[model samples]
Each structure stands twice: as C-alpha cells, then as structure tokens.
Target: PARGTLLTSNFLTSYTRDAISAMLASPEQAKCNVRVAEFTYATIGVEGEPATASGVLLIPGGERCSGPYPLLGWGHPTEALRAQEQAKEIRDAKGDDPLVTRLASQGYVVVGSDYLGLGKSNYAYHPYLHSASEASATIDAMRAARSVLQHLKTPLSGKVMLSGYSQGGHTAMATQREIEAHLSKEFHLVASAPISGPYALEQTFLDSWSGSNAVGENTFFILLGSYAIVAMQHTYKNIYLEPGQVFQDPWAAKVEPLFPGKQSLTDMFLNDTLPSIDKVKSYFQPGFYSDFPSNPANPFRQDLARNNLLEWAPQTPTLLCGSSNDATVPLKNAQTAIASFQQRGSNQVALVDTGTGNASDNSAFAHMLTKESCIVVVRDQLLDKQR
Candidate 1:
C-alpha cells in the first residue's frame, strides 16, 4: 500500500483548490485558512454487506491546533449528496455554511461526509432504507476523517456532534444510535439533533388521510419504498406492482432514474405518478401484504417493519425538533419520537416546535416545514456554544 503524510494541501488540491485559493487570498484566510482533506473508509454490515463512504475535513479559519477540537459530523438533506451540498452551497448547508462559517470563524473543524454513494463514485448504490448501513457508513467516515486529521497533526478532540434535516436528520439519529449503542467507549458523542425526521415508520398514519399529504406522497414513493426494496425486500415483494420486475416499464422507468441505476425498487417507486391510491394499489399483484394500505396484514407485525433510528435505546443528549404543519412528516411523528426516547429513559431528549401548525390546511407546508426549521435550530444550537 502506498502510504504518505496525507497533508491538508493534497486533499484541497484535488477538487477544491480554486475555491480554497480564492478564500486564502481573502482577509478570512489571513486569520484562518479553510483547507479540505479528502478521505475514504469502508463499513461492513450484517450479512457482510460492505459500503465505502467518503468526506472532506474543513479546518478552522485560523492557525491549526496541536490537539483535536470538537468534531461536528454534519449530514445534508434530500438530494443533498450532489456536489453543491458537500461543497457547503445548499440552502440548508451548515457547519461550513454562512452561519457555520461564523462558527468555524470562531474556531471549529467541521467534517462533512458525502454519505456512501454520493460523491466520488457515481455508480454506487444509495442504500435507501438501510439506516444501519447509512449510519455505519457515516460513523466510518468520521473515523476516516479523524485518521486523516491526526496524521496531519491537526486538532481533533475525538468528540463529535450530530446534526441533519429530513434524510440527513434521519442519518444523524442513526449515527447517534450507532455511537451510543456500540462506539461510546471510543468516542465522546456529546449530542445529536435531528430535525423533521420520521423517527418511526407509522403504517397507520400512512394509511389514514395523512397519506394524502404531499410529504406522505413523497415519503411513500421515494423514501419508504427505497428503504423497503433494499432493506425490506420481503415487504417489496408483498406490496409492489410486480414481484420480480427489476428492469421493466413503469417500475424501472419511474424509479431507476432517482437512484442512478443501482437504486433499489423502493427508491425507484418514488417516481410513481399514479393518480389515486386505489389505482396505485391495483398495480400490485394479488396477496400483496402491507400496512400502509387497508390490507389484512397483522398490525403487530407492521410495527416490527420499522427499523432505523427509532429502534435503538436512546443514550446521547438529543434535540428532536419538528413542525405540526409538516406535510411530509406529521407533527405526531415527531411527538412519537420524543415519547419513544423518553420511554426508553433517554433523559437528554428535548423537543422543539418550529412554529409549524395545522398541517391539514397548509398544503405547501408539507415536507418542507421541518426541512426549513432544522437550519435555524442547528444554527442556534451550535452557535450558542461559541458564546
């Protein structure tokens, strides 16, 4: 293996040299230069499933420190895996974001992972519903970042904080679970704040009028199905239009594009444009068992279907924030999360309402409700630490 002194310069010089150079010329870099170091790590899951994750290390604005500083593992929102998200140029971008800029300006090294398949490899699988897979990949990415920074003699206290919105929020919670569940002995996982996450998969809510909500629609087709296909293949076999139609007309045409070819059937379902529930259900083969729809599947078993951030016992100090008006994920969903953690004896959980109300009437305030609030909450939560 070719091993070298993985300097921050080498990482930046790869893809972000121009941007780094421009900033270095500015008065900002005069005080603290923002240099990025690229690194990769592999995560092996149950059944020996392996996924490789990557990320960038952003040094604070001023002189580099001798010892580690606090680490913030930031995850981006939906479709945020694009270059723009990792580059800290999205609407919900934080840590290195404008608000985060000030945070870094004050002195904090932010490490942003591009998830498993987002950045370096275009043909990688999205691992849609595999929250454990996503969480593992994220934790592994943190390890990779730490290894790199330590090699460069940069400060990286081995302490980490988790933050995310929507899908990213989901990732944050999963990361928190993994750390507390397994890696606590090796890491100082100070806190985790997930904004607008589904937490638990409620089949009843999806079956009720809430299903008509825009957020529900997106979740059903995009997020839920994506997860079901890969992680819950049995569920897909029971619920989808065709059992084994991996590369056919509607299923492939509609879903494959979203996941970049390697997308699971669940992820591909997000492209569903069916006009009505009945019509959508009709496409499924008979004996298609599921809970979201009015089927005869045992409800007890339905609850078991949920596997992700919600299943584990909560340990880290957590801030769970969401809006009642969120169409994509209901306020009740957020409440359920808080209750679940509280019931699990997690004393650090705090629920914050982002002024979202009456989701039934507000059509536009669907999935976007919680998505927007997360940025503000994260900013306030983290930035407050500087003071």
Candidate 2:
C-alpha cells in the first residue's frame, strides 16, 4: 500500500516515478556519477501554528571522500502541486538547466524545494504572502536537504549558494537573509543570483497593464500573479476580495485552479483584457502589501529589512542579471538591487544587462552572456584570485 504523504498528488505520481527511473537509466544525468536521493522534514509551527516541514535531497555518487562538497540550493519557479513534483524535475531534468548541470559537473551538489503549500498540506492559513513564512520554509528545506544528504553518508562542503528566478528569486533572497541571520554555523551561503525578479513588491508594477496587448500576446502576462494571489488567499475571502468581482466574473472561476498550473495561468491571463489588472487590484487589497509592521508577531520575529539578502553587503560573489526589456519587472529594479549590493561593499558584483544586444556593443545582457563567459567570469573573478 502507498503510504499517505504530502507528495501524493497526480503530478507527483508521474513526475517522481519518471525522474527516479530516468536517473537510474541515464548515466549522464548524474554528472560525475552523482547519486540522487529524496527525503522529507517536518517544519514546526508553520501551517498549524506549528507546522512540520519536509523536503528532498540529491548527492554525488561513487566512493565517499572524507570531505564536504559545495551545495547549491536551487529554487524553482512557482509550479507543481507539491515538493515531489518540484524535486523530481531537478532529479530528472537537472541536465535541462545548463547552469545546474554545469555546477554539478563542477562538483557542486544541488538541492531544491517544493515550497510549502504546493507539496504539503493546504492548511487554513496561506503563508506565501508572508516573507518570514517564505523564509522559514525555504531555510528549513535547506536544512532538510543537508540532513538527508548526511544520512546517506554524503559530505557537503560548508559553502552553499542560493539561486532562483522570478518567484523563486524572491524566496531565495529571503532564504539568504534568514540563513545569514540564524544559521551561520551550519550554513555559509557563498553567493546568490536572483534573476529577473520583482525585488520590491511594494512598487506600482502590479497596478495596471496598459496598451492594447492584453488581448493577444500580452494576455498571459497581466493575469498570472493577479490570479495566483486570489487563489492562494481565498481563505481571507472577505477582507481580500470585493464580492462582486469574486462572484460576478466568469474569469475568476477559470483563474482559481490555474495557479498551480503555470502554463495555464499564463494562458488565462493572456486570454482576456476585459477586466484589466487595475480593476483586479481591489480584489487583492487586504493582502497586497497591505501592511508591513516594524515588528512581526510570534515565532516570526525579524523584519525583512533585517533579513533581506540584498540589503546585506554581499558576502559572496554575485551575478545579477536582468533583461532590460523585461516588462513584468522593470529594469530599474535591477539597478536598485545592483546599487544596494555595491553600497554594501560586495566583492565581485557582476551586474550584466541582457538587453540591446544587437543595437549596443556593450549589451552584455543575460541572453548574450554565454555559459562559457559566465564560467570564465566566475573562475577568473571569484575563484582564481585573478581580478
């Protein structure tokens, strides 16, 4: 009989089984003959005010060397329904992400999490909106992965790196802050790269989607987050949404379930322009950065200012890359982030502008920054001691 686990979802069933099978079948998938493993941890006081946390882990295979290996904590985009779906993707698809594959080939062990609500119990409270909650879940996932790797007799290098994009980027930065503040002994985050992220949610980017592009190609862009937040905060139905918008719209009915389905979420948002995001903002009122107290209550003790990774002087070398043409997250956000890190005196901040590649010669934009160049930059600037 299949044991009852948080990972028991339709997506998980296919994803996990397929990934494990592929890992065993394909030698190249496991760079340097690395071994892949999975496990879970119970996070305390989270969901039920004392929630249990669990996660999965992957390690290099073959003879164990009496050493710790560098660990890369990977945060995937918001997709899937649980941890298994997320981890299985990495286990099977690590090869797909040239960056992860390159890192693993370079002897770095990578671990990823499924976040909280997606793979675990959908408790009365949704914590994704809360920075501390996101931080707690992310940090715990790292701990859980570490513990699982150790149990399998795999040694992890004390140096850890955090990397993510979009929503995952938000979580990664939060994780970096929490790890720096509390778990310095067990975890030493060497660097972080939060690519193409909405670093500041308090900005006006969420307000409206102008131009007539909302109907065709632009349809999916405007509605993804708008729909996702609504789906996540449905519990706080009254304070969060206006009754008319919630009940009177047919889009709401269609948008609700698409949150977990990223492609579908994008499609629904792109499919309509009738009710613009400006009109949808009121539905997210009670939850949209509604309040940020100087202090948080209960187990959640620290303010984001104290914990946000970007605020701290970059302890490790960083690579901040963003598309200048990214409409969702304006280029100014990247500029602000780069300035914050530089002001903090980070050693090697490689801020590359991945825009105007064709028009400008200095367009060292992300898309143009080849993998080989990224490797060369890292090796020469950070590792080689070669300026």
Candidate 3:
C-alpha cells in the first residue's frame, strides 16, 4: 500500500490567522499571525516499509521579521487508531492543541504529525504504542514539513526542537532517539519536552491493570487493551486471527470494528458492554492475560518490549514533565525514564512535576496541567536559545 505514493506531496489547503483563531480555545494567546497548511507525505510503517502519511505545517504569518524560524516537531496524543475521522479531529484541534498553537504563536514552525493510519494514510492500523512507527511517522513529517517550508520561501534557522503530550510524549522521545541516531546530518535537536508519556511501557501496562478499582477504570483498561491488541495484530499476523482469539464474548465480535470505524470510547462503552478488571481474566484468552506480562518470550510481551522508550539514552536537553497526581499515566514513567537516562550517561535530562493534585481529579486536568508546564519549559528554552 505504501508504494502507491510519493514523499512530501504538496499541501492540501492553507488556513489564515483568523481561521486558526476560530478553532483555538484561547484566541488571545495567538500572539503571532500564523498560517497553517495541511499536507501529506510518505513515511515508513511498522515493518519499516514506505507508506503515505499526513500532517499540518504551521508558519509565522504577516510581516516576517527574522530570516529563519526555529523548527518544532510536535506529536499529538492518542485518538482513533484507524478511522480517518481522527485526521479531521487533528485538523480541527491544531489551533486548540496547547503545544501546537502555542509553539507556532511563539514563532516556531511547528510540524504536527497525524501519525500513520489515523490521517490520510490508507494504512489499515496505527501501531498504537509502537515506537518505531511513531518515530518513523514523526521523522518523515518533519522532513516533509521542511520541504513545504522551503517551497513557501520560509527559512529555517536549522535548530530543531521536540514536544508532545500523552502518547505523543512517547513519540517525541522516540523521534528524538531516531533523529539523534540516524538523521543527525539532516537536523540538530536543540531541546525536547515529552509530557506525560508511558516511557516505561512494561511497567505502565502492569500498573494500569494491577490494582485499579475506580469506577469506569475497567472500561478504560478494556478500551486500551482492545486498541493495543488490534494494533499488534496488524503488525504481526500470528498475534491474532480474529478479535475473538484475544477478546472474550461479544467484545471479541464488537471491539475490532468499533476502532477501525468512527466509534469513540464513550460510544463503545454506552452501546457495547465493558468488562471489569476483576473480570479481566475472562476478557482475554486462557493464557494471554497471564502469559503476556509474565513470559518475556511471549509474542505480545516481545512487542511491548520493542516499544519501550527507556532502553536508550538521549543526548539532547530534555524535560520530562508529568503530574505526580496523574491517574492515567503514572508519574513513575517519567521517573524511571530519567533514572534510565542518567544510568546510561545522559546528563541533560530533568523531570518537572506539575503539582500534587488528588488522584480522583479528572486525568485530563492532570495531563493538561503537565502540558501547560511543558509549554513554559519549551518557551524558556527557546528564549534562552535566542539569547
């Protein structure tokens, strides 16, 4: 499917500052006149095959004071894995996506990847937590965005920065790793801020399912598990033949289609029933739930291991920001990643805890607070670089 497209295709449409402002939650925060253009590009899929992907490139508009603007590669949080509707969501949310619009308003040319499968790409499944796909899509989007900028006569100062939230935080770190290792000749990363990501994948997965008795916790875990297994199936054939092999009862029949289609988590929960954590054993196959976490040699466990982000060291200045009170992604993810990086001789990594909030508070609030903190961190870094 990837062979059908070319890399860095022309932009689809461009949006003016007024149009962008209309989509933003805080229009007044749009300090700079910004123009955004939706574009499609080619990237590599999970199997390291070429595939077409899509994203938007934001540039400083109106009178350009500087010769070149700093480049920022932005990764978005998790959304629909396969539905094209996810693309529209990204298009609609660009202006409102805290880091994206905020960075563009601060004079950075932000390249936001819709990631594989979720956007214009015809790829069947987005490799949800697959680090390789995440890195590939982001790196390719940055490359394509650079081409679009050159075509538009916008100069880049050759300084690249990275930032993202939730799943995107993991992707930002993955992209940084990819660039630092492979694309160093093409781009230089000045700084990176990965906010509230499950950097330590294996631990995060275990923690999420271990001891959680909150209302709707099972609903959330089931949704995540369904998405992940489906994604794994797409990447590896032996993982599952049908959803039934992994999911139990009617969920096996309903979960797969719900994701590759337009249904949201709420819609799925309301329409289809969700099993509880205590019933998690009944949700999966006989040994899958037990073997997946315990057996390192298990296919599912191997996949999870491959996606873990803390395996390598990052050399660029990095800020790992998360809420100590986060219920979605535990704070240990950041702490573990920092410790791993330090152990591997990375001296440029630091963790910033937003604040101590109650775990009962909406996870969205905790994530948002961390995001806001990350914005300030990146803004300060950019300012320091300018100085």
Top TM-score model: 3
Tens digits of per-residue lDDT, candidate 1, 264-337, equal 32333444442234344443333332433554363322532554355445777677877655655655656777
The collision pairs in model 3 are none
lDDT per residue as tens, model 2, 36-78: 5554555533432545444445454433223467777766554
Flag regions of model 1 displaced more than 4 Å: 1-10, 13-33, 63-68, 80-106, 121-124, 204-210, 213-231, 234-249, 252-254, 261-292, 295-304, 356-366, 369-372, 382-387
Query: lDDT per residue, candidate 3, 52-154, as tens digits?
Result: 7888677775453354788888888776635543335535664455544566765788787788888687677777887888888888788877777877789
Give the Cα lDDT of each candidate.
0.53, 0.48, 0.71
Question: How far out, in Å, is residue 283 in model 2?
Answer: 11
lDDT of 2: 0.48
The candidate that achieves the highest lDDT relative to the unseen native structure: 3
